[PDB]
């Protein structure tokens, strides 16, 4: 047996896959410097932002007039979005619905409405049907989450509810995130309908008429869609992570506002100007960052690394080796 | 220079960097993106 981490001769044997090494110079591996500490930097915003009244609301809007709300400059918490109901559907595209407590987003959009029971599958990327092309359309590069839950005990009534409407007739399919509130009559025929009902003149709205008696696949469902935008920005909104003091001139691993890395942070001389947040290099990688608690610029440089070679005669003659470190001045090994 | 510039390709994945892929998706799903990136980079280096 041979231990591949005892001495350079053993490493050479382990690389060559042999118990005898002949005369020559062999390239064994590379040497790096490991991190010692760990820091996390997040913005100092501590207030919360509206999530209770988005879900604990009295009346949601119809499908064709879906309610839109913008969420920014807060601290998001998603633990409270667990006990909505005994059973509910929670599907996230582009993110996993367990890791969105340590991610920083630019702007959050919340769209709320109420849908027929069996049409929940139609709120999805690139799906066709009745509401996905005439009421609510989603893009093909969506990055967000969809939540749906039962609303029989609250919405359906015995006396009769007719306050929820959808649209059935339209010229062309809707652009994503586009709303229509027109009531102009349909023109299937060749003659004008002069704003009166008749054949080929249909009013492009319809009612649900929910009653507590229909089958399990027909009761109303409440649907809310969350849209994110994970890009480069001041990062107005993100969740509950505790900050830590920053260190300099030491190889550590860092998490700057959602950007994870390892390296050495140094005071910067770049000529940033107000709107510039971070910088790049020739190879399209991050080089400079701006600390979101002091508004100062730091430069990132990976800590020392290099290549190691072993010079030995044949194992038949001796077991002595010499080590060559490539491209380094060994006053700074 | 072109070998260096190939590092910004996506190869059908959701991002051109690895840390955000590992910090946004669960282990069951990040494997496809990691495989795509690894295969693309291996092909580029082999061609070189």
């Amino acid at each position: 047996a041979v231990d591949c981490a005892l001495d350079p001769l053993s490493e050479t044997k382990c690389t060559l896959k042999s118990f005898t090494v002949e005369k020559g110079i062999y390239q064994t591996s590379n040497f790096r410097v490991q991190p010692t500490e760990s820091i996390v930097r997040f913005p100092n915003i501590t207030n919360l932002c509206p999530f209770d009244e988005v879900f604990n609301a009295t009346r949601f809007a119809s499908v064709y007039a879906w309610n839109r709300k913008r969420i920014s400059n807060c601290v998001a918490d998603y633990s409270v979005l667990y006990n909505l109901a005994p059973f509910f559907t929670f599907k996230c595209y582009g993110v996993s619905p367990t890791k969105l407590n340590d991610l920083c987003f630019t702007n959050v959009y919340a769209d709320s409405f109420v849908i027929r029971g069996d049409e929940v599958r139609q709120i999805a990327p690139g799906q066709t049907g009745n509401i996905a092309d005439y009421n609510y359309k989603l893009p093909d590069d969506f990055t967000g989450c969809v939540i749906a839950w039962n609303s029989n005990k609250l919405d359906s009534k015995v006396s009769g509810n007719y306050n929820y409407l959808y649209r059935l007739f339209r010229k062309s399919n809707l652009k994503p995130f586009e709303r229509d509130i027109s009531t102009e009559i349909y023109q299937a025929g060749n003659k004008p309908c002069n704003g009166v009902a008749g054949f080929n003149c249909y009013f492009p709205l319809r009612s649900y008429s929910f009653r507590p008696t229909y089958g399990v696949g027909h009761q109303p469902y409440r649907v809310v869609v969350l849209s994110f935008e994970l890009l480069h920005a001041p990062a107005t909104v993100c969740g509950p992570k505790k900050s830590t003091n920053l260190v300099k001139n030491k190889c550590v691993n860092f998490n700057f506002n959602g950007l994870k890395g390892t390296g050495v942070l140094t005071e910067s001389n770049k000529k940033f100007l107000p709107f510039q947040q971070f910088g790049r290099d020739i190879a399209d990688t991050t080089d400079a960052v701006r600390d979101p608690q002091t508004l100062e610029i730091l430069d990132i440089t990976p800590c020392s690394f290099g290549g190691v070679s072993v010079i030995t005669p044949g194992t038949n003659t001796s077991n002595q080796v010499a080590v060559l470190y490539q491209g380094v001045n060994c006053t700074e090994v | 220079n072109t070998l260096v510039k190939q590092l910004s390709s996506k190869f059908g994945a959701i991002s051109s960097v690895l840390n955000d892929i590992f910090s946004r998706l669960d282990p069951p799903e990040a494997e496809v993106q990691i495989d795509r990136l690894i295969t693309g980079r291996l092909q580029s280096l082999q061609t070189y």
Partner: peptide, 28 residues
């Protein structure tokens, strides 16, 4: 020599960026 000097003069940050990706150049 004179001609050798002329020939040597005739033929002539990116290196650091390449090195930080793992590509190095060995000496003769």
């Amino acid at each position: 020599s004179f001609i050798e000097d002329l020939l040597f003069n005739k033929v002539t940050d990116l290196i650091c960026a390449q090195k930080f990706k793992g590509l190095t150049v060995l000496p003769p």
